[PDB]
Amino acid sequence: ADTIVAVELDTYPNTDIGDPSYPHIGIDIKSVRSKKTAKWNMQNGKVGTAHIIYNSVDKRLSAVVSYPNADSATVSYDVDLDNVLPEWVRVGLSASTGLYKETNTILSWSFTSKLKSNSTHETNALHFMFNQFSKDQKDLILQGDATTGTDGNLELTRVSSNGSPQGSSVGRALFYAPVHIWESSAVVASFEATFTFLIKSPDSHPADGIAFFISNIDSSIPSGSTGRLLGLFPDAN
Amino acid sequence: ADTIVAVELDTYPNTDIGDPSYPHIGIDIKSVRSKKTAKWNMQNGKVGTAHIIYNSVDKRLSAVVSYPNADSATVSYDVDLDNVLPEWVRVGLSASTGLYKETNTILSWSFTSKLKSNSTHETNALHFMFNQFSKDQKDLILQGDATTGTDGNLELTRVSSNGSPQGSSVGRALFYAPVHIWESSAVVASFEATFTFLIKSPDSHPADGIAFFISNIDSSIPSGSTGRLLGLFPDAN
Amino acid sequence: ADTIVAVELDTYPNTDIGDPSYPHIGIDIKSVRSKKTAKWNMQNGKVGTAHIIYNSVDKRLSAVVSYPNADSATVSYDVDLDNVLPEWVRVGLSASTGLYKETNTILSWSFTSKLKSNSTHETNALHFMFNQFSKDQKDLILQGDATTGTDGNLELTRVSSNGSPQGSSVGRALFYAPVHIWESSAVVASFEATFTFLIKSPDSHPADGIAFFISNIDSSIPSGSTGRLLGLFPDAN
Amino acid sequence: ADTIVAVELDTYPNTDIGDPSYPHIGIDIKSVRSKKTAKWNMQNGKVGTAHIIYNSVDKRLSAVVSYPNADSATVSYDVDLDNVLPEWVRVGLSASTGLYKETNTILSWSFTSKLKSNSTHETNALHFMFNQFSKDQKDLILQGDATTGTDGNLELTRVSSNGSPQGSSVGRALFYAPVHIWESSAVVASFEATFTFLIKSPDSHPADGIAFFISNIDSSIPSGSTGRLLGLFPDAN
Ligand SMILES: CC(=O)N[C@H]1[C@H](O[C@@H]2[C@@H](OC[C@H]3O[C@H](O)[C@@H](O)[C@@H](O[C@H]4O[C@H](CO)[C@@H](O)[C@H](O)[C@@H]4O[C@@H]4O[C@H](CO)[C@@H](O)[C@H](O)[C@H]4NC(C)=O)[C@@H]3O)O[C@H](CO)[C@@H](O)[C@@H]2O)O[C@H](CO)[C@@H](O)[C@@H]1O
Ligand SMILES: CC(=O)N[C@H]1[C@H](O[C@@H]2[C@@H](OC[C@H]3O[C@H](O)[C@@H](O)[C@@H](O[C@H]4O[C@H](CO)[C@@H](O)[C@H](O)[C@@H]4O[C@@H]4O[C@H](CO)[C@@H](O)[C@H](O)[C@H]4NC(C)=O)[C@@H]3O)O[C@H](CO)[C@@H](O)[C@@H]2O)O[C@H](CO)[C@@H](O)[C@@H]1O
Ligand SMILES: CC(=O)N[C@H]1[C@H](O[C@@H]2[C@@H](OC[C@H]3O[C@H](O)[C@@H](O)[C@@H](O[C@H]4O[C@H](CO)[C@@H](O)[C@H](O)[C@@H]4O[C@@H]4O[C@H](CO)[C@@H](O)[C@H](O)[C@H]4NC(C)=O)[C@@H]3O)O[C@H](CO)[C@@H](O)[C@@H]2O)O[C@H](CO)[C@@H](O)[C@@H]1O
Ligand SMILES: CC(=O)N[C@H]1[C@H](O[C@@H]2[C@@H](OC[C@H]3O[C@H](O)[C@@H](O)[C@@H](O[C@H]4O[C@H](CO)[C@@H](O)[C@H](O)[C@@H]4O[C@@H]4O[C@H](CO)[C@@H](O)[C@H](O)[C@H]4NC(C)=O)[C@@H]3O)O[C@H](CO)[C@@H](O)[C@@H]2O)O[C@H](CO)[C@@H](O)[C@@H]1O
Ligand SMILES: [Ca+2]
Ligand SMILES: [Ca+2]
Ligand SMILES: [Ca+2]
Ligand SMILES: [Ca+2]
Ligand SMILES: [Mn+2]
Ligand SMILES: [Mn+2]
Ligand SMILES: [Mn+2]
Ligand SMILES: [Mn+2]
Predict the structure, then answer these.
(1) How far apart are the first and last CA of chain B?
(2) How many B×C Cβ pairs under 8 Å?
(3) What does DSSP assign to residue A151?
(4) Which domains does chain D have, with CATH numbers?
(5) Rounded distance between C-alpha atoms, residue B150 and residue B107, angstroms
(6) Structural Rg of chain A based on CA atoms
(7) In A, which residues are within 8 Å of D131 by CB distance?
(8) Residue D102, exposed/middle/buried by CB under 10 A (0-12, 13-18, 19+)?
(9) Which among C185, C227, C174, C188 is positioned nearest to C2, based on CA atoms?
């Protein structure tokens, strides 16, 4: 079973499995039942921005989601990633739909990871920035229904040619190269991710959400993880 | 008076004004009496590295000081900088000696500040990195006994030609350009500073320490700030 | 008697002083009479992007100006900056209008300067990025009619309250901190500048242009350098 | 066959296949017979630094190799990479030994690639920096005799326990993720690579050299490319 650490932008509330009674953002550590959440005033049809940050000194994972001229939603949680994730991982974006749908369009995504070992200026780093996605994005591993190229955007879940979202869809996009997230000999290790999305829904209550996640290198979409499971978890435990 | 926020690498314990009975690192908010401190195993004659970080989401200021092949001292403190510092500040390094002395050599210094406002990828940033200092460092405002050029280093406090430290010396070096540390319309604001130093001392107990600070633009060394005041405070209150 | 090195986005052809008989971009070394130019299909009312680059290895200064879904204008020129500019300079943007006007709006501006001396990874660098300008931009030195704040933009030349550009106007904005552009002991020295502008003109032929420039630290707008002189030169020599 | 663009630090002169009669640095475009070379005063036993740069505006590939306190060798060549390399490539380091040997130790390696298309601040970038290599470097694809971990360095060619180099050895190390080197809709595309090496040789004339290269994603060591072929070319055409 995959080891997952994710920050979810949960648009549909599934109270039966622990979700709060409204759209929210949460920090999930190995389970879809968020260890911490915050109310999120999702704005249907508007481009928003998510920013995730973490550093080994504070051992605190935080996320801020906001829309232009609007209050931002903030969530933070104390977690020592050394004891949760393996040394090498893959980072990515996941999204899903179930009975209800929504577009899970990613317009830009950037990631920076830095490791500082016990030495002078000896800092190892990885940084990638996508402000436009091409049809053949060789450095991205697309899983499920995720596709790129449509107007230079990344569509995590299935969308029809006329532009409408489909139900029962799952898709992920992971950066090709493995990332060295931590090391026992690192004085300081830190990462930062940012991505802009566009969640549009024609129906009543949009579903299900988008999630930025970190996982074991060989992770793949668990079978039957559409809907509430966000393409990350095998069950709702 | 000046508004000061600093991270001190205090080498001499002044128990009468609140210092712990050993060398330590501390976080000072408008007072030399550190709001929080941590034991620091200072290594006389060795080059060490200090790393300070802060972000508006966690509103937590942290510092890590370490020497190659040795544990690192860490100190953190929750503080909302919007309520302590003016919108525009100047960042710098300060050091002093009193009855006892030590060299306060800075071998490198780097700083990165980022402000993200309510817009797409509209991030304002400033970054400077000095790995060598010249005799005529036009982008540094030197105050007190601070000088540059000797072997490409920055000597905060007075050192004679033969290479030995002088007592009752104070010196600071501030980056020329003002830094926009925070803004009411910022989704995320964060900064990071790093510097390597070399504290060498002929005497028994070295004194007094080095400090990375942030202050009002027009700040200058308070009178009598040699010794325990680290060139930052006018009194010990 | 300022030393000026500039890349001009010349909107009005002043053939009496050497201009080609059409809008163009040019590389000026100490004189308004460009050492090299290239035809530029200026698009009234549209946001464009200028990108300037230079490195001490090739000792070649190049610039590219372009608008979306349009051909870009390119101009390059071989010049050893060590022999033209002082070691320390200030970088900035300049603009002017004469009998004819146009708005000289700057929507963003970034600059990166790197110096690599004779040592291991010993690189000195400076980088600043403005994606939004505030009313009180303390890190910018505004000269002439230049102002900031209007919608988060930088208006190099005077614009009335309704939005119409004014004739006979000059404005410049220089980054506060001096920049160490070159050093005799540098293995590699290089810089890069990028800025987006919006030139709008209600009249027949727009005038006069915008220019990215590098100068001696104490430079200021020369007397009567409105119009064709772009706020950079004292005369048309 | 593979498409190769490389910058070689050739330590052994093979006059028969076109090499100058002294150690040199050269730019190879699809052939081991450099399109341009420059004399290189290789210093056996000392750590050196290579720096490669290129940009689509000047369409010029340049390299600078140097040792602390010594003049540097420089070589440049005009080449439009859009017409030589496929859109997606992999970048790496190669080295080989033949009848004669030398150690081809890489102590650090960094690369930055940027693509700016017809859009506002829409820049795609990739950057990685290794200042230490681990035993299990998951983001590197090691080919041939290349190994990592020995004192935190990357040994491109076979070396023994006591530290001496072996003859008839070839090794390469490519960054895991493919790199989007150019795009028809890019206003500016550029890259920069830097690496520090240590060439030590106990015998008469060291051989054969180190090379930084760019190739088609699926490139692999051609059969019998030890010696003068540098693990890059199938023959000496
Ligand atoms: C076709 C498909 O892709 N199927 C996926 C599947 O998707 C799930 C599907 O769920 C539809 C409904 O399923 C159940 O009936 C309920 O869970 C229902 O949720 C509402 O009711 C439950 C129980 O009463 C509540 O706990 C839950 O919070 C929710 O409440 C409703 O919330 C709205 C908004 O707040 C409110 O306005 C309503 O009043 C409130 N209803 C009530 C009665 O109070 C589901 O709607 O589609 C969902 C949305 O797309 C997914 O989230 C579901 O997962 O999932 C499985 C497993 O993950 C997958 O394998 C399958 O392919
Ligand atoms: C010349 C100059 O620049 N003067 C500065 C001046 O510098 C100060 C000066 O202080 C010297 C001594 O001053 C007092 O005598 C004491 O504060 C003494 O400190 C020891 O004693 C006090 C009081 O008993 C203790 O509270 C304090 O912790 C310290 O204790 C001693 O600590 C050592 C190490 O742990 C231990 O080995 C001893 O056993 C212990 N002593 C006892 C009795 O227990 C000072 O030494 O020089 C200092 C060092 O350079 C500075 O830190 C002082 O600031 O400062 C003023 C005001 O800031 C400035 O204006 C002036 O120019
Ligand atoms: C009020 C103010 O700010 N004054 C500035 C002043 O600004 C200058 C002013 O110039 C206006 C005209 O001045 C002269 O009459 C001419 O130079 C004229 O330029 C045209 O004519 C000359 C000479 O014949 C040509 O060499 C030149 O290319 C231009 O040609 C005309 O171009 C258009 C477009 O291509 C074409 O359609 C016309 O047919 C063609 N005319 C002819 C006869 O062929 C000036 O227009 O305003 C200018 C524009 O705003 C500025 O560029 C001028 O500098 O400048 C001084 C000194 O710099 C400053 O101190 C003063 O305050
Ligand atoms: C074991 C192995 O890995 N083999 C590789 C193989 O490696 C090659 C091998 O070459 C050894 C010698 O091979 C021939 O004898 C010559 O090419 C010789 O080179 C010298 O002589 C030629 C011809 O006369 C000159 O053109 C050439 O420049 C060189 O000149 C000598 O240079 C020195 C220094 O300037 C000077 O002092 C000498 O006087 C001068 N000699 C003369 C006669 O003038 C080779 O030495 O090992 C080499 C070094 O390790 C490799 O570079 C060779 O490639 O290569 C093949 C093909 O790539 C590979 O498949 C095989 O596995
Ligand atoms: Ca949910
Ligand atoms: Ca003290
Ligand atoms: Ca003109
Ligand atoms: Ca050779
Ligand atoms: Mn949830
Ligand atoms: Mn203290
Ligand atoms: Mn002109
Ligand atoms: Mn050669």
Answers:
(1) 13
(2) 74
(3) G
(4) 1-237 (2.60.120.200)
(5) 11
(6) 17
(7) 119, 121-124
(8) buried
(9) C174
